[PDB]
């Protein structure tokens, strides 16, 4: 309504030159908007419309004198202060909502995803070196009907496949009820 009521320079602008401060970050080079003395029920109050965000009606005013246009930017102090509350839903509806490079490991979140029924997830081997790769058929599990299994020649090239198939079991397993 009125921040000041008596101000005014005498060699400068005042409601544009001395009005420079808050619109540095509020960012409004007003091609100026004028609503001076707009009161219908007999009120000549200068709403020489200063702006808060680019069109708005910053306005607080009391008379056609030093009274009025100062509290124009009254709420042009505030709508930056106001509205700092959230705008988005659970995430930004942006087409770029959070990246993060999801997990490449398998048996890490398997026991998480073993939440199908909170499974026993277990892995073991007897890695032959007889001929060296002589044979590694893998036998482990996630789920409870597709016993996760692998097969291979050399150890690390085949270490996972059952456990891979384990971690990749339950999301395809219809199990969890018993059959």
């Amino acid at each position: 309504g009125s921040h000041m009521e008596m101000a005014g320079d005498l060699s400068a602008g005042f409601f544009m030159e001395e009005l420079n401060t808050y619109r540095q970050k509020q960012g409004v080079v007003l091609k100026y908007q004028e609503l001076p003395n707009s009161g219908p029920p007999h009120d000549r109050r200068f709403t020489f419309q200063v702006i808060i965000d680019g069109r708005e009606f910053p306005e607080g005013e009391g008379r056609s004198k030093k009274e009025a246009k100062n509290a124009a930017a009254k709420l042009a102090v505030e709508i930056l202060n106001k509205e700092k509350k959230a705008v988005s839903p659970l995430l930004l509806t942006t087409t770029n909502s959070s990246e993060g490079l999801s997990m490449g490991n398998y048996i890490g979140l398997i026991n998480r995803i073993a939440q199908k029924k909170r499974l026993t997830v277990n892995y073991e081997q007897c890695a032959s070196g007889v001929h060296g790769p002589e044979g590694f058929h893998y036998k482990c599990k996630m789920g409870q009907k597709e016993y996760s299994i692998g097969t291979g020649s050399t150890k690390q090239e085949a270490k996972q496949l059952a456990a891979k198939l384990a971690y990749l079991q339950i999301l395809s397993e219809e199990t969890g009820s018993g059959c």
Binding site: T94, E99, L101, N105
Partner: protein, 122 residues
């Protein structure tokens, strides 16, 4: 270089972690290091250094690296040197530019920590 004015964040293990670039992204304005990989984007980077202080203000920097809990890396960041080394007020830009890279895709950026408290200021 007292511990009260010289802090060793990076231990003897944070010094030599190497990773590989799918599609990196780089920018710089002054004495700071910046990077995001664009295929490997938005990974945890843990930028630790053995820095120093004086009068609650600037002494020095070493280097920064990238670390996660899983241990991956999206890119690399560090306090960069220049002709005078690392200009403090230029760290306002070098760390300044070092804050907004990945932010377009809603995933915030990593910034160097050494020149932040005492160069990125002033």
């Amino acid at each position: 270089t007292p511990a009260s004015r010289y802090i060793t964040d990076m231990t003897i293990e944070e010094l030599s972690r190497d990773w590989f670039m799918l599609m990196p992204k780089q920018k710089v304005e002054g004495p700071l290091c910046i990077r995001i990989d664009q295929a490997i984007m938005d990974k945890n980077i843990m930028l630790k250094a053995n820095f120093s202080v004086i009068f609650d203000r600037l002494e020095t920097l070493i280097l920064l690296r990238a670390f996660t809990e899983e241990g991956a890396i999206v890119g690399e960041i560090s306090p960069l040197p220049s002709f005078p080394g690392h200009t403090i007020e230029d760290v306002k830009n070098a760390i300044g530019v070092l804050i907004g890279g990945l932010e377009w895709n809603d995933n915030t950026v990593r910034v160097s920590k050494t020149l932040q408290r005492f160069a990125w200021g002033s």
